[PDB]
Amino acid sequence: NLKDKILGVAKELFIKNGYNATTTGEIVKLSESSKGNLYYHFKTKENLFLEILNIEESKWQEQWKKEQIKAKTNREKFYLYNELSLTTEYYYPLQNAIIEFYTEYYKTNSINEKMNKLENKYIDAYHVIFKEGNLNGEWSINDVNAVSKIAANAVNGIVTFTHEQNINERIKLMNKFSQIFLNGLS
Amino acid sequence: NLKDKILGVAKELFIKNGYNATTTGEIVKLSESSKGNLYYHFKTKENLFLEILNIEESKWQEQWKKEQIKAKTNREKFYLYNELSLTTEYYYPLQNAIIEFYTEYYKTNSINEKMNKLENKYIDAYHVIFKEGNLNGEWSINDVNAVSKIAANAVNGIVTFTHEQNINERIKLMNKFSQIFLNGLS
Ligand SMILES: N=C(N)c1ccc(OCCCCCOc2ccc(C(=N)N)cc2)cc1
Numbered sequence: 001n002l003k004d005k006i007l008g009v010a011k012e013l014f015i016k017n018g019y020n021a022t023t024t025g026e027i028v029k030l031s032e033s034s035k036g037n038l039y040y041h042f043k044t045k046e047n048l049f050l051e052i053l054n055i056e057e058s059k060w061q062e063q064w065k066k067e068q069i070k071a072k073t074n075r076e077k078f079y080l081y082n083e084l085s086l087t088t089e090y091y092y093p094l095q096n097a098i099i100e101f102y103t104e105y106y107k108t109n110s111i112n113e114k115m116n117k118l119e120n121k122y123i124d125a126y127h128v129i130f131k132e133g134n135l136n137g138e139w140s141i142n143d144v145n146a147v148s149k150i151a152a153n154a155v156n157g158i159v160t161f162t163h164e165q166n167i168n169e170r171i172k173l174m175n176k177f178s179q180i181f182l183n184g185l186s
Numbered sequence: 187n188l189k190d191k192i193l194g195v196a197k198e199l200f201i202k203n204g205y206n207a208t209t210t211g212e213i214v215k216l217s218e219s220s221k222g223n224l225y226y227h228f229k230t231k232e233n234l235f236l237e238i239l240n241i242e243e244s245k246w247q248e249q250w251k252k253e254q255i256k257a258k259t260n261r262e263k264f265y266l267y268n269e270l271s272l273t274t275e276y277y278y279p280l281q282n283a284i285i286e287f288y289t290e291y292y293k294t295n296s297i298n299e300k301m302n303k304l305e306n307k308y309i310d311a312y313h314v315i316f317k318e319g320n321l322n323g324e325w326s327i328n329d330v331n332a333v334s335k336i337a338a339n340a341v342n343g344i345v346t347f348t349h350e351q352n353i354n355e356r357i358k359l360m361n362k363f364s365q366i367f368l369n370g371l372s
Contacts, residue, residue: 096288096289099285099347102349102350150359152347153347163292173332176329181366
């Protein structure tokens with residue numbers, strides 16, 4: 001494909017480099033396509049980027065739904081989601097670029113928007129898990145929205161700022177995290 | 187001194203223009219030094235920047251030392267340290283140069299080695315708090331190093347990824363997090 005082949009190349013650079021880093025020049029020279037191409041569906045370069053962010057979040061959320069089945073209690077769904085976060089090839093590998101992207105677009109208002117709409121998906125999984133856990137009586141949270149935001153950010157932190165040491169050590173910490181977090185909910 | 191003048195000038199340049207655009211040549215002339223002297227003290231821009239980061243960490247340590255007297259118990263020092271981290275990073279001018287530097291060297295090993303000596307210094311704050319907490323029956327944790335790595339990165343995610351919300355909300359969420367987390371340890 002083409003419209004779907006650019007996405008694929010940019011994704012690679014954005015990760016393999018960063019937002020500021022990788023450039024529309026490089027995107028094109030490693031992919032092969034005129035400039036305008038990136039102008040219809042791809043308004044700006046930050047449009048191509050918010051696009052990739054959309055796919056990835058979709059894909060990771062899809063995979064998680066095709067995987068949460070292995071977890072009976074929501075308590076277990078919480079643990080599972082946090083460990084899978086460490087291994088997916090989706091979304092989380094773009095956190096640095098995103099961090100960077102935000103530190104240079106928070107100055108526009110069209111940014112504090114999309115970058116905040118994508119946040120709804122991001123925290124949704126925890127919302128379902130947490131609200132469902134309330135219905136299922138596993139715990140009793142009155143500020144589900146706050147708790148979901150906190151879990152998602154905390155977890156994205158462990159996933160993102162421990163990205164150097166051994167994966168089993170990480171999975172270990174993440175499980176100890178899920179342990180402590182949930183134990184503090186009640 | 188000439189060494190400290192290089193550090194001070196570079197720090198300002200990195201803040202005004204960020205990492206990528208700042209050159210050792212700018213640094214040499216503005217501090218009235220030489221490529222040779224700069225080579226002798228730091229070898230490279232990356233190294234120079236890492237040295238700056240260590241000085242910054244010390245300054246941050248010394249500041250924590252004074253501010254933590256506002257907290258009798260370690261339960262308090264925990265709440266206070268997290269809140270501080272969120273508020274001071276909100277207006278820390280080096281954060282962009284730092285974001286630009288990490289997301290651009292978390293691939294190399296030359297650099298990625300030291301970053302961890304540095305990241306470990308930051309995690310120590312938690313280690314001290316938690317150990318002290320044990321010795322005063324505020325809690326009993328048997329995996330101090332571990333809970334410490336977790337608190338550090340979890341807090342870190344909350345500081346880094348919430349960046350699209352009004353400041354009191356973020357402080358509200360950070361404090362809620364400290365409450366939950368400290369609750370799951372008891
Ligand atoms: N001249 C001075 N007085 C001075 C100079 C530099 C300084 O350095 C501030 C660094 C601020 C950014 C603080 O960033 C974090 C992020 C996360 C955690 C955490 N997760 N614990 C802790 C700190 C402090 C004081």
